[PDB]
PDB file of C-alpha atoms in Angstrom:
ATOM      1  CA  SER A   1     -97.373 141.087  58.704  1.00  0.00           C
ATOM      2  CA  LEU A   2     -98.974 144.345  57.660  1.00  0.00           C
ATOM      3  CA  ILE A   3     -95.696 145.200  55.945  1.00  0.00           C
ATOM      4  CA  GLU A   4     -96.154 142.307  53.508  1.00  0.00           C
ATOM      5  CA  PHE A   5     -99.937 142.779  53.222  1.00  0.00           C
ATOM      6  CA  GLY A   6     -99.396 146.488  52.363  1.00  0.00           C
ATOM      7  CA  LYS A   7     -96.942 145.602  49.653  1.00  0.00           C
ATOM      8  CA  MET A   8     -99.296 142.987  48.102  1.00  0.00           C
ATOM      9  CA  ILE A   9    -102.140 145.528  48.038  1.00  0.00           C
ATOM     10  CA  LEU A  10     -99.958 148.224  46.416  1.00  0.00           C
ATOM     11  CA  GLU A  11     -98.650 145.785  43.804  1.00  0.00           C
ATOM     12  CA  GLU A  12    -102.095 144.476  42.944  1.00  0.00           C
ATOM     13  CA  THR A  13    -104.126 147.630  42.886  1.00  0.00           C
ATOM     14  CA  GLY A  14    -101.792 150.589  42.523  1.00  0.00           C
ATOM     15  CA  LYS A  15    -103.263 151.920  45.807  1.00  0.00           C
ATOM     16  CA  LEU A  16    -101.602 152.445  49.163  1.00  0.00           C
ATOM     17  CA  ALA A  17    -103.131 150.273  51.896  1.00  0.00           C
ATOM     18  CA  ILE A  18    -103.300 153.315  54.146  1.00  0.00           C
ATOM     19  CA  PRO A  19    -105.618 155.169  53.652  1.00  0.00           C
ATOM     20  CA  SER A  20    -107.402 153.467  50.724  1.00  0.00           C
ATOM     21  CA  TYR A  21    -108.032 150.215  52.493  1.00  0.00           C
ATOM     22  CA  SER A  22    -107.623 151.089  56.179  1.00  0.00           C
ATOM     23  CA  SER A  23    -110.843 153.084  56.768  1.00  0.00           C
ATOM     24  CA  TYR A  24    -113.103 151.707  54.041  1.00  0.00           C
ATOM     25  CA  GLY A  25    -116.645 150.574  54.713  1.00  0.00           C
ATOM     26  CA  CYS A  26    -117.455 148.502  57.726  1.00  0.00           C
ATOM     27  CA  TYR A  27    -114.590 145.931  57.627  1.00  0.00           C
ATOM     28  CA  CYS A  28    -111.547 147.406  55.890  1.00  0.00           C
ATOM     29  CA  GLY A  29    -109.178 148.414  58.630  1.00  0.00           C
ATOM     30  CA  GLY A  30    -111.101 148.447  61.869  1.00  0.00           C
ATOM     31  CA  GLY A  31    -114.093 146.400  60.891  1.00  0.00           C
ATOM     32  CA  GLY A  32    -116.036 144.021  63.091  1.00  0.00           C
ATOM     33  CA  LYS A  33    -119.718 144.994  62.811  1.00  0.00           C
ATOM     34  CA  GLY A  34    -122.521 145.251  60.278  1.00  0.00           C
ATOM     35  CA  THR A  35    -123.253 144.304  56.729  1.00  0.00           C
ATOM     36  CA  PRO A  36    -120.389 144.979  54.319  1.00  0.00           C
ATOM     37  CA  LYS A  37    -121.186 147.886  52.055  1.00  0.00           C
ATOM     38  CA  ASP A  38    -119.856 146.587  48.728  1.00  0.00           C
ATOM     39  CA  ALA A  39    -117.631 143.949  47.118  1.00  0.00           C
ATOM     40  CA  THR A  40    -114.368 145.555  48.396  1.00  0.00           C
ATOM     41  CA  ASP A  41    -115.759 145.604  51.918  1.00  0.00           C
ATOM     42  CA  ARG A  42    -116.766 141.997  51.510  1.00  0.00           C
ATOM     43  CA  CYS A  43    -113.121 141.228  50.663  1.00  0.00           C
ATOM     44  CA  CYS A  44    -112.216 142.782  54.070  1.00  0.00           C
ATOM     45  CA  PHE A  45    -114.908 140.743  55.825  1.00  0.00           C
ATOM     46  CA  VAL A  46    -113.602 137.478  54.319  1.00  0.00           C
ATOM     47  CA  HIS A  47    -110.067 138.529  55.273  1.00  0.00           C
ATOM     48  CA  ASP A  48    -111.156 139.256  58.831  1.00  0.00           C
ATOM     49  CA  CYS A  49    -112.809 135.815  58.917  1.00  0.00           C
ATOM     50  CA  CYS A  50    -109.707 134.149  57.534  1.00  0.00           C
ATOM     51  CA  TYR A  51    -107.543 135.669  60.334  1.00  0.00           C
ATOM     52  CA  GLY A  52    -110.250 134.632  62.760  1.00  0.00           C
ATOM     53  CA  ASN A  53    -109.544 131.037  61.759  1.00  0.00           C
ATOM     54  CA  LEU A  54    -106.013 131.330  63.232  1.00  0.00           C
ATOM     55  CA  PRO A  55    -106.408 132.190  66.923  1.00  0.00           C
ATOM     56  CA  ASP A  56    -102.833 131.103  67.903  1.00  0.00           C
ATOM     57  CA  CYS A  57    -101.173 133.121  65.070  1.00  0.00           C
ATOM     58  CA  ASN A  58    -100.318 136.834  65.111  1.00  0.00           C
ATOM     59  CA  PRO A  59    -101.076 138.067  61.539  1.00  0.00           C
ATOM     60  CA  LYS A  60    -100.250 141.732  62.070  1.00  0.00           C
ATOM     61  CA  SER A  61     -96.680 141.107  63.218  1.00  0.00           C
ATOM     62  CA  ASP A  62     -95.510 137.757  62.041  1.00  0.00           C
ATOM     63  CA  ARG A  63     -93.618 138.261  58.804  1.00  0.00           C
ATOM     64  CA  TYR A  64     -93.778 135.844  55.877  1.00  0.00           C
ATOM     65  CA  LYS A  65     -92.135 135.737  52.491  1.00  0.00           C
ATOM     66  CA  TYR A  66     -93.784 135.660  49.065  1.00  0.00           C
ATOM     67  CA  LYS A  67     -92.618 135.841  45.454  1.00  0.00           C
ATOM     68  CA  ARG A  68     -94.278 136.199  42.049  1.00  0.00           C
ATOM     69  CA  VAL A  69     -94.122 133.448  39.485  1.00  0.00           C
ATOM     70  CA  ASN A  70     -95.432 134.750  36.138  1.00  0.00           C
ATOM     71  CA  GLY A  71     -97.197 137.643  37.949  1.00  0.00           C
ATOM     72  CA  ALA A  72     -98.989 135.355  40.371  1.00  0.00           C
ATOM     73  CA  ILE A  73     -98.479 135.593  44.161  1.00  0.00           C
ATOM     74  CA  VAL A  74     -96.703 132.571  45.629  1.00  0.00           C
ATOM     75  CA  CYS A  75     -96.377 132.117  49.395  1.00  0.00           C
ATOM     76  CA  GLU A  76     -92.927 130.802  50.386  1.00  0.00           C
ATOM     77  CA  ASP A  77     -92.599 128.139  52.940  1.00  0.00           C
ATOM     78  CA  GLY A  78     -92.213 129.380  56.574  1.00  0.00           C
ATOM     79  CA  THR A  79     -93.860 128.288  59.830  1.00  0.00           C
ATOM     80  CA  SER A  80     -97.366 127.020  59.641  1.00  0.00           C
ATOM     81  CA  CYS A  81     -98.846 130.366  60.871  1.00  0.00           C
ATOM     82  CA  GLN A  82     -96.771 132.277  58.269  1.00  0.00           C
ATOM     83  CA  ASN A  83     -98.186 129.995  55.578  1.00  0.00           C
ATOM     84  CA  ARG A  84    -101.805 130.476  56.626  1.00  0.00           C
ATOM     85  CA  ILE A  85    -101.416 134.193  57.143  1.00  0.00           C
ATOM     86  CA  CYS A  86     -99.913 134.621  53.703  1.00  0.00           C
ATOM     87  CA  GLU A  87    -102.832 132.668  52.021  1.00  0.00           C
ATOM     88  CA  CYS A  88    -105.336 134.882  53.822  1.00  0.00           C
ATOM     89  CA  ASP A  89    -103.575 138.000  52.603  1.00  0.00           C
ATOM     90  CA  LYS A  90    -102.993 136.788  49.024  1.00  0.00           C
ATOM     91  CA  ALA A  91    -106.734 136.090  48.714  1.00  0.00           C
ATOM     92  CA  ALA A  92    -107.649 139.571  49.979  1.00  0.00           C
ATOM     93  CA  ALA A  93    -105.195 141.294  47.525  1.00  0.00           C
ATOM     94  CA  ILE A  94    -106.663 139.333  44.633  1.00  0.00           C
ATOM     95  CA  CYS A  95    -110.184 140.086  45.888  1.00  0.00           C
ATOM     96  CA  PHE A  96    -109.285 143.823  45.927  1.00  0.00           C
ATOM     97  CA  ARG A  97    -107.867 143.628  42.410  1.00  0.00           C
ATOM     98  CA  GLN A  98    -111.030 141.841  41.227  1.00  0.00           C
ATOM     99  CA  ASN A  99    -113.290 144.546  42.568  1.00  0.00           C
ATOM    100  CA  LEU A 100    -111.302 147.635  41.733  1.00  0.00           C
ATOM    101  CA  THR A 101    -113.913 148.761  39.151  1.00  0.00           C
ATOM    102  CA  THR A 102    -116.491 149.183  41.977  1.00  0.00           C
ATOM    103  CA  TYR A 103    -114.151 150.770  44.561  1.00  0.00           C
ATOM    104  CA  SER A 104    -116.042 153.861  45.767  1.00  0.00           C
ATOM    105  CA  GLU A 105    -114.488 156.802  47.603  1.00  0.00           C
ATOM    106  CA  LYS A 106    -117.845 157.428  49.258  1.00  0.00           C
ATOM    107  CA  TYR A 107    -116.995 154.498  51.633  1.00  0.00           C
ATOM    108  CA  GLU A 108    -113.703 155.997  52.774  1.00  0.00           C
ATOM    109  CA  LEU A 109    -113.881 157.129  56.450  1.00  0.00           C
ATOM    110  CA  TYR A 110    -117.266 155.471  56.634  1.00  0.00           C
ATOM    111  CA  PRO A 111    -118.942 156.351  59.939  1.00  0.00           C
ATOM    112  CA  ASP A 112    -119.229 153.656  62.543  1.00  0.00           C
ATOM    113  CA  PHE A 113    -123.024 154.176  63.394  1.00  0.00           C
ATOM    114  CA  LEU A 114    -123.879 153.281  59.784  1.00  0.00           C
ATOM    115  CA  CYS A 115    -122.446 149.779  60.170  1.00  0.00           C
ATOM    116  CA  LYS A 116    -125.641 148.029  61.078  1.00  0.00           C
ATOM    117  CA  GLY A 117    -126.633 144.412  60.735  1.00  0.00           C
ATOM    118  CA  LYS A 118    -125.219 141.031  61.506  1.00  0.00           C
ATOM    119  CA  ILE A 119    -123.040 138.629  59.509  1.00  0.00           C
ATOM    120  CA  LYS A 120    -121.332 135.417  60.733  1.00  0.00           C
ATOM    121  CA  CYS A 121    -118.094 134.017  59.129  1.00  0.00           C
TER     122      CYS A 121
END
């Protein structure tokens, strides 16, 4: 769930999911159209695609558990949806941490009409 995702993001990056990653670019938050603007946005695209691979799961509300072993994120065992959701989210958090040096506030509240283009998962 967004509660766990939010916590991963904060832990990894030192940034609050809302609003740093909830209105960024074309895919972070309410994405769904266009070419991703930068590496962070691409992280959101991949994350959207990962969720899109689980059409009978409910990633926003189904809670999972995770722990850290030596700083690394480890998804605890739960149902099979919880497992897959967690791996999607873990990958996004690490993607965000990897691209922190190019995070650009100019993409915050990015306007919808500028999200142009096409990109398949």
